[PDB]
Amino acid sequence: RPRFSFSIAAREGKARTGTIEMKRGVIRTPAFMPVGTAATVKALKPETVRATGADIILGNTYHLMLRPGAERIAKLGGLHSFMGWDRPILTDSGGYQVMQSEEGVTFLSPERSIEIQHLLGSDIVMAFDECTPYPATPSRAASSMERSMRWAKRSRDAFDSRKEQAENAALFGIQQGSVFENLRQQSADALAEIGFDGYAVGGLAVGEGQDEMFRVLDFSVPMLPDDKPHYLMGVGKPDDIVGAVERGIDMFDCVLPGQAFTWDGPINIRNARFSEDLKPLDSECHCAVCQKWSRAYIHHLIRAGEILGAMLMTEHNIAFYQQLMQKIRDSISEGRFSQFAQDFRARYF
Amino acid sequence: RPRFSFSIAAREGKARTGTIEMKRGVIRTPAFMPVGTAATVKALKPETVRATGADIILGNTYHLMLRPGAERIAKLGGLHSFMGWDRPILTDSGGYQVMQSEEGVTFLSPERSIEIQHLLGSDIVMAFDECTPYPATPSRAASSMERSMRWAKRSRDAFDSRKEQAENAALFGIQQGSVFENLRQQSADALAEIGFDGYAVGGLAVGEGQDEMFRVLDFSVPMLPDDKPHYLMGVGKPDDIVGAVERGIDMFDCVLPGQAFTWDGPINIRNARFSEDLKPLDSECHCAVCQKWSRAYIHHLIRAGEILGAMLMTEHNIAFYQQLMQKIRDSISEGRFSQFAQDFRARYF
Ligand SMILES: CNc1nc2cc3c(=O)[nH]c(N)nc3c(CCO)c2[nH]1
Ligand SMILES: CNc1nc2cc3c(=O)[nH]c(N)nc3c(CCO)c2[nH]1
Ligand SMILES: [Zn+2]
Ligand SMILES: [Zn+2]
């Protein structure tokens, strides 16, 4: 397969569906990336993560840098070998989880972030950025944005200077700018000038609320190169994903999928009303959990603090997200995504 | 299949190998029964428990009686349906975990214990007994033993008076008597007079140490009917199992399989010497964990408090026990068990 190839198979308004081809596999887009904190997707074997339909997972660099150490994982064969996932892995750059000078952060520099991700053997490397607090003054937003762009250039150069990394991995840049249109535009132009394999929209999902996140996406995503993947970092709830895809986003990650997702909205399985409910978590869900166990059982397990409860809840939730992504992909492919988004919402809410 | 049929296919000294046929499946003996506390074998799906080679699991009545309640599980379809295990289940009677009058224990009577196990849908019901503290004075041992035998009769009658239970399930009686030969003999004769499907040796593995446990087994197991299964409750360590089989025991249960069993003895995977060990937990073990992950990875997981660490450690350990039982079964079948026991021990220690 190539190092990196993004192809758009179909479109509807700003939404797109297609594929990212990488040496370790193909990623169907719009994509949801389960989060593996500490070299594991919580409570799931990789084979289970893959059976839910995930094409790619996200590796949490900050934690790995602290344990087991990036150098140790490299000696051990790389993250893929270590945890037993052989498909693409995206690594964040560590800044975000760490939260200060122009050279980096003490507690990590653009150079050391890129090196750590290489040591982990990441397939999609994130540039090292400075996330901007919300809310932010225009001056402070600007300063932070500016630093990040400087750091994006340093990231690019560090990535390119490492031949095995440049030839086998991809590099994504991260747009910053808080909620300010002019700042987002300067950030997009600066990253397009440097040139990246894909473009993340950073600095959102940091307490601004869905209306303001969607308002910023409305002008920010069209500033990014159309022909490259658009990743919204840290999002999110099913409703957020649907609206983000409608605004041109292709890739997502979220941590925490007793809350269970259903097509009728989320439920909390700890609720006493589920103690004798023999129905599965969701009535339509095709996942193994919903094939085999009841609400009543999982209810008991979670209230009992049993590990099988977390295993089963997480498999379901990640399977639900994957099925959501599949329905978004299929509806765009068939040009009925706007109808799917309306039907989804009516029911979900 | 019949309600209950025990057949002995082969023998060597006091050791035996054969099968117990029950309506929900066949149990290969000598058998190890994984323990499901709170209607789950800790950190394992039932399909995983079965893939390790378990033929039967033990259900923990005391906990189930407290949550979710035996009546609730019955309404929900029985323990098998509830937790998704369709093979035989053995239930303890609850006394042991609860730890007082002739009628039962307040905090459970022979009658209520039998009824609860029926409500759970148990395949092998344990009589309700009074476990005797260790150490015990001869007088106190005797009194306790006597009560238990009285309670064994009440258990028998309660079981038999419930037609669906008597026709579909089996009842095991429990020998008591502390470490005193005369008391064990009175206990065995009293239970044989009542008549049971199988005979457990109770009151051991309660701090007496392996030498004294083996000394008591030496005279106690031959007192039980030869043609029925002999169950040693609560045992135990691999070395204990091997010596117990050599003394005529057919069935076992143990809770807690960072400790990992290997044919070279137990290891503690938390030990820093495993942080970069790429070997599997055990060099010969055929389980999925040893096929796929390293010591170094599981080491990281356990130290990180990750749930995948417990899942992987427990699958390995229960698979190891099952492989141990298989090698005991095969060696008796081939009349080389005493040689296997010696080779095992040399290596294990
Ligand atoms: C939960 N919301 C959220 N907003 C984010 C914003 C950023 C960001 O701006 N930059 C980087 N590197 N990471 C981010 C992350 C971690 C994504 O898992 C975010 N996560
Ligand atoms: C861990 N050692 C042990 N000794 C036991 C002794 C007894 C006993 O004497 N009677 C009953 N009912 N249960 C027992 C149990 C629970 C077995 O999981 C024991 N467990
Ligand atoms: Zn499901
Ligand atoms: Zn193993």
Provide the number of structural domains found in chain B.
1
Helix (H) or strand (E) holding A17, with range, is strand A15-22
- Alpha carbons within 13 angstroms on the beta-carbon side of residue B227 total 4
At which residue do the structure tokens 């005529």 appear? B248
Contacts of B157 (CB under 8 A, 6+ apart): none
Q: Is B194 helix (H, G, I), strand (E, B) or coil?
A: helix
C-beta of residue A136 within 8 angstroms of C-beta of residue A172: no
- Return the amino acid letter for A23: K
Using alpha carbons only, what angle is made at residue B189 by residues B184 and B195, rounded to the nearest 5 degrees? 125
C-beta of residue B43 within 8 angstroms of C-beta of residue B307: yes
Q: Is the peptide bond before B222 cis (omega within 30 degrees of 0)?
A: no
Alpha carbons B122 and A213: distance in angstroms, whole number:
55
C-beta of residue A129 within 8 angstroms of C-beta of residue A161: no
C-beta of residue B290 within 8 angstroms of C-beta of residue B316: yes
The first and second tokens of residue A47, run together, are 């084979």
Q: Is the CB of B110 under 6 A from ligand 2?
A: no
Q: What is the CATH number of the domain that holds B33?
A: 3.20.20.105
What is the three-state SS of B280-334?
CCCCCCCCHHHHHCCHHHHHHHHHCCCHHHHHHHHHHHHHHHHHHHHHHHHHHHC
Q: Is the CB of B93 under 6 A from ligand 2?
A: yes
What is the three-state SS of A37-100?
CCCCECCCCHHHHHHHCCCCEEECHHHHHHCCCHHHHHHHCCHHHHHCCCCCEEECCCHHHHCC
Alpha carbons B156 and B174: distance in angstroms, whole number:
12
Residues of B with CB below 8 A from A38's CB? 300-301, 304, 306
B218 is catalytic: no
Method: X-ray
Interface A:B, Cβ pairs < 8 A: 90
List beta partners, residue A337. none
**Resolution, rounded to a tenth of an Å?**
1.9
Q: Is the peptide bond before A135 cis (omega within 30 degrees of 0)?
A: yes
At which residue do the structure tokens 């080491």 appear? B299
CB atoms within 10 A of CB B327: 16
Alpha carbons B247 and B236: distance in angstroms, whole number:
14
Contacts of A184 (CB under 8 A, 6+ apart): A175, A176, A177, A216, A219, A220, A223
Q: Is A161 helix (H, G, I), strand (E, B) or coil?
A: coil
Question: How buried is residue A69: exposed, middle or buried, by Cβ count under 10 Å (0-12/13-18/19+)?
Answer: middle
Which alpha helices (H) appear in A121-177, and where do they start and end?
A: 138-160, 163-168
Which residue from B89, B124, B126, B131 has its CB within 8 A of the most atoms of ligand 2, so it is best to mutate? B131
Q: Is the CB of B129 under 6 A from ligand 2?
A: yes
CB atoms within 10 A of CB A91: 25
Query: Which residues crowd ion ligand 3, with CB under 5 Å?
Result: A 285, 287, 289-290, 316
A92 is catalytic: yes
Helix (H) or strand (E) holding A253, with range, is strand A251-254
List beta partners, residue A28. A19
Residue whose C-alpha is closest to residue B226's, from B73, B16, B3: B16
Residue whose C-alpha is closest to residue B324's, from B257, B230, B228: B257
Contacts of B227 (CB under 8 A, 6+ apart): B6, B8
C-beta of residue A67 within 8 angstroms of C-beta of residue B304: yes
Using alpha carbons only, what angle is made at residue B130 by residues B57 and B60, rounded to the nearest 5 degrees? 20
C-beta of residue B55 within 8 angstroms of C-beta of residue A262: no
Residue whose C-alpha is closest to residue A172's, from A122, A217, A222, A219: A122
User: Is A38's CB within 8 Å of B296's CB?
Assistant: no
Alpha carbons A115 and B200: distance in angstroms, whole number:
61
Using alpha carbons only, what angle is made at residue B321 by residues B316 and B325, rounded to the nearest 5 degrees? 145
Residue whose C-alpha is closest to residue B337's, from B10, B8, B12: B12
Helix (H) or strand (E) holding B113, with range, is helix B110-120
Alpha carbons B39 and A297: distance in angstroms, whole number:
9
Q: Is B242 helix (H, G, I), strand (E, B) or coil?
A: helix
> Which positions in chain A have a beta carbon within 8 angstroms of at least one beta carbon in chain B?
38-40, 42-45, 67-68, 72, 75-77, 82-84, 275-276, 278, 292-294, 296-297, 300-301, 303-304, 306-308, 310-311
Alpha carbons A192 and A199: distance in angstroms, whole number:
9
- Residue-number span of the structural domain to which A111 is assigned: 1-349
